[PDB]
Amino acid sequence: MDDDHEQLVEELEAVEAIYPDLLSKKQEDGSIIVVKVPQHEYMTLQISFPTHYPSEEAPNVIEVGVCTSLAKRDLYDTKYLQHLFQEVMDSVFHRGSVCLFDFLTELDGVLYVEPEEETEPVQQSDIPTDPFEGWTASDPITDRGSTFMAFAAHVTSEEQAFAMLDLLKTDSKMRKANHVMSAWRIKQDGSAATYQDSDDDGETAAGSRMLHLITIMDVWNVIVVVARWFGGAHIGPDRFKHINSTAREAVVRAGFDS
């Protein structure tokens, strides 16, 4: 193929640039590949590129293996990681790019969390502050014990937001959280197809707040998702205020005020 190869090979060149030592190829081009697991370097991942390759949908993790496990089997397993890996792959499955930039995001966060059985120390912090493909999340807030994080995204009619949000609810980090809620509203400036209905999604306090939030901002077509998290005593008082500033930039950047 020509075009199909150019777009694909391009995303490949990038992932190949980001992970030159980690990612290996099994085929003549890239179609099928084997990328290793970063930081732990032992488990390798056998991935494929479907007829609906990442430009269309996303890659196809076929299986994962690990060299020198034995006792590691007690901690993790090939099929086990195979399942989580698939889930985090599915969680990025629908964006305009190959959703990869969102994918690494999954592994980077999920790989270290839940190591053993202990209390979450203040030596770790995973507050979302970087943007995603199709997805733009960077607006967290800190509270007593709790953690607030909102993910924003500029979207057309339901088919767009509905999918990208569906999947964000099928997202692993959203599931690692305590509760997640979302608010959306579709405005048809040209047509009359407006989807008007939100929900509490769990915490009515935030659901309504977001509703008021988008209402007062007077911006439609954009979605937002608030997730809750618990870590440390207050995490860091400085996060709240400084990340507030960062948050305002995120939301604004996500098309709220653009």
PDB file of C-alpha atoms in Angstrom:
ATOM      1  CA  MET A   1       0.000   0.000   0.000  1.00  0.00           C
ATOM      2  CA  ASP A   2       1.004   3.599  -0.486  1.00  0.00           C
ATOM      3  CA  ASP A   3      -0.976   6.095   1.598  1.00  0.00           C
ATOM      4  CA  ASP A   4      -1.848   3.482   4.191  1.00  0.00           C
ATOM      5  CA  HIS A   5       1.823   2.871   4.631  1.00  0.00           C
ATOM      6  CA  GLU A   6       2.830   6.484   4.800  1.00  0.00           C
ATOM      7  CA  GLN A   7       0.419   7.453   7.596  1.00  0.00           C
ATOM      8  CA  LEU A   8       1.140   4.225   9.464  1.00  0.00           C
ATOM      9  CA  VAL A   9       4.931   4.222   8.999  1.00  0.00           C
ATOM     10  CA  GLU A  10       4.854   7.842  10.159  1.00  0.00           C
ATOM     11  CA  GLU A  11       3.222   7.132  13.524  1.00  0.00           C
ATOM     12  CA  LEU A  12       5.641   4.199  13.604  1.00  0.00           C
ATOM     13  CA  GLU A  13       8.662   6.487  13.035  1.00  0.00           C
ATOM     14  CA  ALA A  14       7.564   8.517  16.044  1.00  0.00           C
ATOM     15  CA  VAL A  15       6.921   5.601  18.372  1.00  0.00           C
ATOM     16  CA  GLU A  16      10.176   4.195  16.993  1.00  0.00           C
ATOM     17  CA  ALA A  17      11.881   7.475  17.906  1.00  0.00           C
ATOM     18  CA  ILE A  18      10.416   7.574  21.381  1.00  0.00           C
ATOM     19  CA  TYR A  19      11.130   3.871  21.924  1.00  0.00           C
ATOM     20  CA  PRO A  20      14.144   2.921  19.701  1.00  0.00           C
ATOM     21  CA  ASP A  21      15.648   0.359  22.055  1.00  0.00           C
ATOM     22  CA  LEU A  22      12.392  -0.764  23.546  1.00  0.00           C
ATOM     23  CA  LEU A  23      10.410  -1.408  20.393  1.00  0.00           C
ATOM     24  CA  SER A  24      11.410  -4.190  18.011  1.00  0.00           C
ATOM     25  CA  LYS A  25       9.886  -5.186  14.671  1.00  0.00           C
ATOM     26  CA  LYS A  26       8.899  -8.719  13.645  1.00  0.00           C
ATOM     27  CA  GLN A  27       7.834  -8.010  10.136  1.00  0.00           C
ATOM     28  CA  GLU A  28       9.294  -6.398   7.032  1.00  0.00           C
ATOM     29  CA  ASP A  29       7.676  -3.076   7.810  1.00  0.00           C
ATOM     30  CA  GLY A  30       5.920  -2.633  11.058  1.00  0.00           C
ATOM     31  CA  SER A  31       2.649  -4.522  10.651  1.00  0.00           C
ATOM     32  CA  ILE A  32       3.665  -6.899  13.377  1.00  0.00           C
ATOM     33  CA  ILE A  33       6.102  -5.870  16.174  1.00  0.00           C
ATOM     34  CA  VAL A  34       7.329  -6.640  19.668  1.00  0.00           C
ATOM     35  CA  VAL A  35       7.831  -3.820  22.110  1.00  0.00           C
ATOM     36  CA  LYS A  36       9.380  -4.392  25.494  1.00  0.00           C
ATOM     37  CA  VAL A  37       8.098  -3.154  28.867  1.00  0.00           C
ATOM     38  CA  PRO A  38       9.840   0.033  30.015  1.00  0.00           C
ATOM     39  CA  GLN A  39      11.337   0.397  33.517  1.00  0.00           C
ATOM     40  CA  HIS A  40      10.925  -3.333  34.243  1.00  0.00           C
ATOM     41  CA  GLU A  41      12.611  -4.595  31.036  1.00  0.00           C
ATOM     42  CA  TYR A  42      11.662  -8.273  31.161  1.00  0.00           C
ATOM     43  CA  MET A  43       8.237  -8.526  29.713  1.00  0.00           C
ATOM     44  CA  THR A  44       7.983  -8.031  26.043  1.00  0.00           C
ATOM     45  CA  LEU A  45       4.734  -7.298  24.235  1.00  0.00           C
ATOM     46  CA  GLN A  46       3.740  -8.978  20.951  1.00  0.00           C
ATOM     47  CA  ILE A  47       1.648  -6.458  19.060  1.00  0.00           C
ATOM     48  CA  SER A  48       0.098  -6.427  15.636  1.00  0.00           C
ATOM     49  CA  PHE A  49      -1.377  -3.973  13.231  1.00  0.00           C
ATOM     50  CA  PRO A  50      -4.944  -4.942  12.187  1.00  0.00           C
ATOM     51  CA  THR A  51      -6.755  -4.413   8.899  1.00  0.00           C
ATOM     52  CA  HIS A  52      -8.131  -1.440  10.813  1.00  0.00           C
ATOM     53  CA  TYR A  53      -4.594  -0.338  11.731  1.00  0.00           C
ATOM     54  CA  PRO A  54      -4.148   2.498  14.332  1.00  0.00           C
ATOM     55  CA  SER A  55      -5.013   5.206  11.773  1.00  0.00           C
ATOM     56  CA  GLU A  56      -8.384   3.508  11.521  1.00  0.00           C
ATOM     57  CA  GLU A  57      -8.675   2.115  15.055  1.00  0.00           C
ATOM     58  CA  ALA A  58      -5.617   1.034  17.067  1.00  0.00           C
ATOM     59  CA  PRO A  59      -2.847  -1.700  17.341  1.00  0.00           C
ATOM     60  CA  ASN A  60      -3.508  -5.345  18.300  1.00  0.00           C
ATOM     61  CA  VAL A  61      -1.696  -6.727  21.311  1.00  0.00           C
ATOM     62  CA  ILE A  62      -1.643 -10.409  20.536  1.00  0.00           C
ATOM     63  CA  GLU A  63       0.340 -11.603  23.574  1.00  0.00           C
ATOM     64  CA  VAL A  64       2.960 -10.757  26.182  1.00  0.00           C
ATOM     65  CA  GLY A  65       5.925 -12.742  27.427  1.00  0.00           C
ATOM     66  CA  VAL A  66       8.548 -12.441  30.076  1.00  0.00           C
ATOM     67  CA  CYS A  67      12.040 -13.740  30.508  1.00  0.00           C
ATOM     68  CA  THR A  68      12.890 -15.191  33.894  1.00  0.00           C
ATOM     69  CA  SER A  69       9.623 -15.091  35.765  1.00  0.00           C
ATOM     70  CA  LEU A  70       9.102 -18.230  37.915  1.00  0.00           C
ATOM     71  CA  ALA A  71       8.489 -16.461  41.232  1.00  0.00           C
ATOM     72  CA  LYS A  72       7.368 -13.328  39.361  1.00  0.00           C
ATOM     73  CA  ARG A  73       4.281 -15.337  38.433  1.00  0.00           C
ATOM     74  CA  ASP A  74       3.060 -14.654  41.950  1.00  0.00           C
ATOM     75  CA  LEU A  75       3.162 -10.938  41.266  1.00  0.00           C
ATOM     76  CA  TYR A  76       2.150 -10.908  37.623  1.00  0.00           C
ATOM     77  CA  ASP A  77       1.591 -13.247  34.742  1.00  0.00           C
ATOM     78  CA  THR A  78       1.711 -13.197  30.958  1.00  0.00           C
ATOM     79  CA  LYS A  79      -2.054 -13.637  30.438  1.00  0.00           C
ATOM     80  CA  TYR A  80      -2.635 -11.275  33.293  1.00  0.00           C
ATOM     81  CA  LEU A  81      -0.612  -8.429  31.781  1.00  0.00           C
ATOM     82  CA  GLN A  82      -2.085  -9.488  28.451  1.00  0.00           C
ATOM     83  CA  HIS A  83      -5.523  -8.571  29.735  1.00  0.00           C
ATOM     84  CA  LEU A  84      -4.565  -5.216  31.271  1.00  0.00           C
ATOM     85  CA  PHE A  85      -2.498  -4.366  28.247  1.00  0.00           C
ATOM     86  CA  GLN A  86      -5.478  -5.047  26.004  1.00  0.00           C
ATOM     87  CA  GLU A  87      -7.687  -2.893  28.242  1.00  0.00           C
ATOM     88  CA  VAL A  88      -5.326   0.102  28.105  1.00  0.00           C
ATOM     89  CA  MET A  89      -5.088  -0.439  24.369  1.00  0.00           C
ATOM     90  CA  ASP A  90      -8.895  -0.429  24.060  1.00  0.00           C
ATOM     91  CA  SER A  91      -8.993   2.665  26.270  1.00  0.00           C
ATOM     92  CA  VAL A  92      -7.223   4.665  23.557  1.00  0.00           C
ATOM     93  CA  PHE A  93      -8.769   2.774  20.568  1.00  0.00           C
ATOM     94  CA  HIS A  94     -10.791   5.824  19.265  1.00  0.00           C
ATOM     95  CA  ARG A  95      -9.038   9.179  18.634  1.00  0.00           C
ATOM     96  CA  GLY A  96      -7.757  10.798  15.483  1.00  0.00           C
ATOM     97  CA  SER A  97      -4.110   9.831  15.848  1.00  0.00           C
ATOM     98  CA  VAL A  98      -3.097   6.340  16.695  1.00  0.00           C
ATOM     99  CA  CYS A  99      -4.073   7.239  20.219  1.00  0.00           C
ATOM    100  CA  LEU A 100      -0.604   6.150  21.221  1.00  0.00           C
ATOM    101  CA  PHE A 101       0.295   9.168  23.068  1.00  0.00           C
ATOM    102  CA  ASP A 102      -2.658   8.311  25.277  1.00  0.00           C
ATOM    103  CA  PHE A 103      -1.596   4.657  25.341  1.00  0.00           C
ATOM    104  CA  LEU A 104       1.900   5.209  26.792  1.00  0.00           C
ATOM    105  CA  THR A 105       0.151   7.364  29.246  1.00  0.00           C
ATOM    106  CA  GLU A 106      -1.818   4.292  30.444  1.00  0.00           C
ATOM    107  CA  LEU A 107       1.227   2.055  30.870  1.00  0.00           C
ATOM    108  CA  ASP A 108       3.343   4.794  32.410  1.00  0.00           C
ATOM    109  CA  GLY A 109       0.790   5.274  35.151  1.00  0.00           C
ATOM    110  CA  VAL A 110      -0.568   1.726  35.559  1.00  0.00           C
ATOM    111  CA  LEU A 111       2.827  -0.066  35.512  1.00  0.00           C
ATOM    112  CA  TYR A 112       4.001   1.320  38.895  1.00  0.00           C
ATOM    113  CA  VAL A 113       0.699   1.642  40.801  1.00  0.00           C
ATOM    114  CA  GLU A 114      -0.305  -1.065  43.298  1.00  0.00           C
ATOM    115  CA  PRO A 115       3.134  -2.716  43.881  1.00  0.00           C
ATOM    116  CA  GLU A 116       2.444  -4.412  47.198  1.00  0.00           C
ATOM    117  CA  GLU A 117       0.228  -4.144  50.227  1.00  0.00           C
ATOM    118  CA  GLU A 118       0.953  -0.932  52.060  1.00  0.00           C
ATOM    119  CA  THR A 119      -0.266   2.627  52.580  1.00  0.00           C
ATOM    120  CA  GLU A 120       0.171   5.168  49.770  1.00  0.00           C
ATOM    121  CA  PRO A 121       3.172   7.326  50.820  1.00  0.00           C
ATOM    122  CA  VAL A 122       3.847  10.928  49.811  1.00  0.00           C
ATOM    123  CA  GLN A 123       6.808   9.731  47.733  1.00  0.00           C
ATOM    124  CA  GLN A 124       4.552   9.314  44.731  1.00  0.00           C
ATOM    125  CA  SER A 125       2.390  11.730  42.773  1.00  0.00           C
ATOM    126  CA  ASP A 126       0.589  11.092  39.501  1.00  0.00           C
ATOM    127  CA  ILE A 127      -1.504  14.189  38.972  1.00  0.00           C
ATOM    128  CA  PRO A 128      -2.432  14.391  35.193  1.00  0.00           C
ATOM    129  CA  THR A 129      -0.803  17.471  33.727  1.00  0.00           C
ATOM    130  CA  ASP A 130       0.070  16.529  30.128  1.00  0.00           C
ATOM    131  CA  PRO A 131      -2.280  16.535  27.087  1.00  0.00           C
ATOM    132  CA  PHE A 132      -3.470  13.533  25.150  1.00  0.00           C
ATOM    133  CA  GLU A 133      -4.320  12.734  21.526  1.00  0.00           C
ATOM    134  CA  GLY A 134      -7.913  13.821  20.842  1.00  0.00           C
ATOM    135  CA  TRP A 135      -7.973  14.119  24.507  1.00  0.00           C
ATOM    136  CA  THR A 136      -6.886  17.087  26.592  1.00  0.00           C
ATOM    137  CA  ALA A 137      -6.524  16.616  30.314  1.00  0.00           C
ATOM    138  CA  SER A 138      -4.466  18.846  32.500  1.00  0.00           C
ATOM    139  CA  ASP A 139      -6.839  20.381  35.005  1.00  0.00           C
ATOM    140  CA  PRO A 140      -6.373  18.836  38.474  1.00  0.00           C
ATOM    141  CA  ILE A 141      -7.106  20.206  41.948  1.00  0.00           C
ATOM    142  CA  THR A 142      -5.933  19.152  45.377  1.00  0.00           C
ATOM    143  CA  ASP A 143      -8.150  18.733  48.448  1.00  0.00           C
ATOM    144  CA  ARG A 144      -7.862  17.293  51.919  1.00  0.00           C
ATOM    145  CA  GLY A 145      -6.958  13.680  51.216  1.00  0.00           C
ATOM    146  CA  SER A 146      -8.803  13.880  47.953  1.00  0.00           C
ATOM    147  CA  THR A 147      -7.578  14.668  44.501  1.00  0.00           C
ATOM    148  CA  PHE A 148      -9.568  16.197  41.771  1.00  0.00           C
ATOM    149  CA  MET A 149      -8.722  15.807  38.148  1.00  0.00           C
ATOM    150  CA  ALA A 150     -10.644  16.929  35.202  1.00  0.00           C
ATOM    151  CA  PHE A 151     -10.200  15.896  31.668  1.00  0.00           C
ATOM    152  CA  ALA A 152     -11.506  18.100  28.894  1.00  0.00           C
ATOM    153  CA  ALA A 153     -12.084  17.476  25.153  1.00  0.00           C
ATOM    154  CA  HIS A 154     -13.467  19.465  22.207  1.00  0.00           C
ATOM    155  CA  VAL A 155     -16.142  17.396  20.470  1.00  0.00           C
ATOM    156  CA  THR A 156     -18.690  17.470  17.617  1.00  0.00           C
ATOM    157  CA  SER A 157     -22.027  15.573  17.884  1.00  0.00           C
ATOM    158  CA  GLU A 158     -22.547  12.546  20.160  1.00  0.00           C
ATOM    159  CA  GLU A 159     -20.946   9.979  17.825  1.00  0.00           C
ATOM    160  CA  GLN A 160     -17.698  11.806  18.513  1.00  0.00           C
ATOM    161  CA  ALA A 161     -17.898  12.544  22.239  1.00  0.00           C
ATOM    162  CA  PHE A 162     -19.943   9.466  22.886  1.00  0.00           C
ATOM    163  CA  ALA A 163     -17.235   7.203  21.609  1.00  0.00           C
ATOM    164  CA  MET A 164     -14.187   9.115  22.954  1.00  0.00           C
ATOM    165  CA  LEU A 165     -16.012   9.467  26.338  1.00  0.00           C
ATOM    166  CA  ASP A 166     -17.249   5.845  26.288  1.00  0.00           C
ATOM    167  CA  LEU A 167     -13.797   4.746  26.094  1.00  0.00           C
ATOM    168  CA  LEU A 168     -12.500   7.269  28.655  1.00  0.00           C
ATOM    169  CA  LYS A 169     -15.027   5.475  31.015  1.00  0.00           C
ATOM    170  CA  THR A 170     -13.489   2.225  29.847  1.00  0.00           C
ATOM    171  CA  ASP A 171     -10.149   3.861  30.702  1.00  0.00           C
ATOM    172  CA  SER A 172      -7.885   2.251  33.240  1.00  0.00           C
ATOM    173  CA  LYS A 173      -6.848   5.409  35.127  1.00  0.00           C
ATOM    174  CA  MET A 174     -10.472   6.470  35.436  1.00  0.00           C
ATOM    175  CA  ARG A 175     -11.090   3.039  36.934  1.00  0.00           C
ATOM    176  CA  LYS A 176      -8.099   3.310  39.255  1.00  0.00           C
ATOM    177  CA  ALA A 177      -9.825   6.294  40.712  1.00  0.00           C
ATOM    178  CA  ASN A 178     -12.492   6.444  43.412  1.00  0.00           C
ATOM    179  CA  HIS A 179     -15.252   8.046  41.329  1.00  0.00           C
ATOM    180  CA  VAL A 180     -15.575   9.631  37.890  1.00  0.00           C
ATOM    181  CA  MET A 181     -18.154  11.992  36.483  1.00  0.00           C
ATOM    182  CA  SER A 182     -18.683  13.734  33.180  1.00  0.00           C
ATOM    183  CA  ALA A 183     -20.730  16.576  31.746  1.00  0.00           C
ATOM    184  CA  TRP A 184     -21.462  17.164  28.083  1.00  0.00           C
ATOM    185  CA  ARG A 185     -23.784  19.107  25.814  1.00  0.00           C
ATOM    186  CA  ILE A 186     -24.081  19.199  22.018  1.00  0.00           C
ATOM    187  CA  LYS A 187     -25.043  22.438  20.327  1.00  0.00           C
ATOM    188  CA  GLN A 188     -26.179  22.502  16.798  1.00  0.00           C
ATOM    189  CA  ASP A 189     -25.596  25.938  15.455  1.00  0.00           C
ATOM    190  CA  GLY A 190     -26.556  24.900  11.956  1.00  0.00           C
ATOM    191  CA  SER A 191     -28.937  22.044  12.596  1.00  0.00           C
ATOM    192  CA  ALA A 192     -31.349  21.355  15.446  1.00  0.00           C
ATOM    193  CA  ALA A 193     -29.797  18.147  16.709  1.00  0.00           C
ATOM    194  CA  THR A 194     -28.919  19.047  20.237  1.00  0.00           C
ATOM    195  CA  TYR A 195     -28.394  16.442  22.885  1.00  0.00           C
ATOM    196  CA  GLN A 196     -29.495  17.900  26.144  1.00  0.00           C
ATOM    197  CA  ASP A 197     -29.104  15.620  29.139  1.00  0.00           C
ATOM    198  CA  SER A 198     -26.515  15.159  31.823  1.00  0.00           C
ATOM    199  CA  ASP A 199     -26.363  13.110  35.020  1.00  0.00           C
ATOM    200  CA  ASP A 200     -24.667  13.018  38.406  1.00  0.00           C
ATOM    201  CA  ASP A 201     -22.468  10.097  37.223  1.00  0.00           C
ATOM    202  CA  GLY A 202     -21.923   9.371  40.889  1.00  0.00           C
ATOM    203  CA  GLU A 203     -21.253  12.538  42.812  1.00  0.00           C
ATOM    204  CA  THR A 204     -24.165  14.938  42.285  1.00  0.00           C
ATOM    205  CA  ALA A 205     -22.071  17.709  43.883  1.00  0.00           C
ATOM    206  CA  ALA A 206     -19.589  17.715  41.019  1.00  0.00           C
ATOM    207  CA  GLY A 207     -22.000  16.816  38.216  1.00  0.00           C
ATOM    208  CA  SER A 208     -24.152  19.870  38.822  1.00  0.00           C
ATOM    209  CA  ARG A 209     -21.046  22.035  39.446  1.00  0.00           C
ATOM    210  CA  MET A 210     -19.641  21.094  36.028  1.00  0.00           C
ATOM    211  CA  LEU A 211     -23.002  21.821  34.522  1.00  0.00           C
ATOM    212  CA  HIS A 212     -23.019  25.254  36.008  1.00  0.00           C
ATOM    213  CA  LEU A 213     -19.406  25.533  34.976  1.00  0.00           C
ATOM    214  CA  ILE A 214     -20.025  24.946  31.271  1.00  0.00           C
ATOM    215  CA  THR A 215     -23.277  26.901  31.386  1.00  0.00           C
ATOM    216  CA  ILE A 216     -21.659  30.077  32.819  1.00  0.00           C
ATOM    217  CA  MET A 217     -18.647  29.736  30.508  1.00  0.00           C
ATOM    218  CA  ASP A 218     -21.316  29.550  27.782  1.00  0.00           C
ATOM    219  CA  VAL A 219     -19.281  27.111  25.825  1.00  0.00           C
ATOM    220  CA  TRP A 220     -20.840  24.090  24.195  1.00  0.00           C
ATOM    221  CA  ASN A 221     -19.428  21.205  22.181  1.00  0.00           C
ATOM    222  CA  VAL A 222     -16.808  20.571  24.804  1.00  0.00           C
ATOM    223  CA  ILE A 223     -16.824  17.799  27.392  1.00  0.00           C
ATOM    224  CA  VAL A 224     -15.280  17.550  30.803  1.00  0.00           C
ATOM    225  CA  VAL A 225     -14.670  14.635  33.184  1.00  0.00           C
ATOM    226  CA  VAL A 226     -13.903  14.920  36.879  1.00  0.00           C
ATOM    227  CA  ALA A 227     -12.197  12.058  38.627  1.00  0.00           C
ATOM    228  CA  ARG A 228     -11.491  11.676  42.309  1.00  0.00           C
ATOM    229  CA  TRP A 229      -8.399  10.187  43.950  1.00  0.00           C
ATOM    230  CA  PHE A 230      -6.971   9.666  47.410  1.00  0.00           C
ATOM    231  CA  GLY A 231      -3.302  10.022  48.280  1.00  0.00           C
ATOM    232  CA  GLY A 232      -1.326  11.314  51.234  1.00  0.00           C
ATOM    233  CA  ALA A 233      -2.754  13.834  53.663  1.00  0.00           C
ATOM    234  CA  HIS A 234      -3.175  16.805  51.309  1.00  0.00           C
ATOM    235  CA  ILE A 235      -0.764  15.640  48.580  1.00  0.00           C
ATOM    236  CA  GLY A 236       0.741  19.083  48.394  1.00  0.00           C
ATOM    237  CA  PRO A 237      -0.971  22.420  49.275  1.00  0.00           C
ATOM    238  CA  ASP A 238       0.990  24.039  46.461  1.00  0.00           C
ATOM    239  CA  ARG A 239      -0.609  21.755  43.878  1.00  0.00           C
ATOM    240  CA  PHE A 240      -4.096  23.208  44.424  1.00  0.00           C
ATOM    241  CA  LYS A 241      -3.136  26.820  43.708  1.00  0.00           C
ATOM    242  CA  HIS A 242      -0.451  26.339  41.067  1.00  0.00           C
ATOM    243  CA  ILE A 243      -2.194  23.557  39.331  1.00  0.00           C
ATOM    244  CA  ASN A 244      -5.320  25.719  39.430  1.00  0.00           C
ATOM    245  CA  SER A 245      -3.495  28.064  37.138  1.00  0.00           C
ATOM    246  CA  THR A 246      -2.418  25.104  34.995  1.00  0.00           C
ATOM    247  CA  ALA A 247      -5.977  23.799  35.082  1.00  0.00           C
ATOM    248  CA  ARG A 248      -7.426  27.045  33.776  1.00  0.00           C
ATOM    249  CA  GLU A 249      -4.939  26.819  30.903  1.00  0.00           C
ATOM    250  CA  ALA A 250      -5.944  23.172  30.178  1.00  0.00           C
ATOM    251  CA  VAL A 251      -9.690  23.792  30.087  1.00  0.00           C
ATOM    252  CA  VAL A 252      -9.194  26.982  28.056  1.00  0.00           C
ATOM    253  CA  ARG A 253      -6.913  25.033  25.687  1.00  0.00           C
ATOM    254  CA  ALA A 254      -9.543  22.268  25.385  1.00  0.00           C
ATOM    255  CA  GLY A 255     -11.679  24.760  23.460  1.00  0.00           C
ATOM    256  CA  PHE A 256     -13.749  25.997  26.393  1.00  0.00           C
ATOM    257  CA  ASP A 257     -12.795  29.588  25.758  1.00  0.00           C
ATOM    258  CA  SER A 258     -11.484  29.063  22.262  1.00  0.00           C
TER     259      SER A 258
END
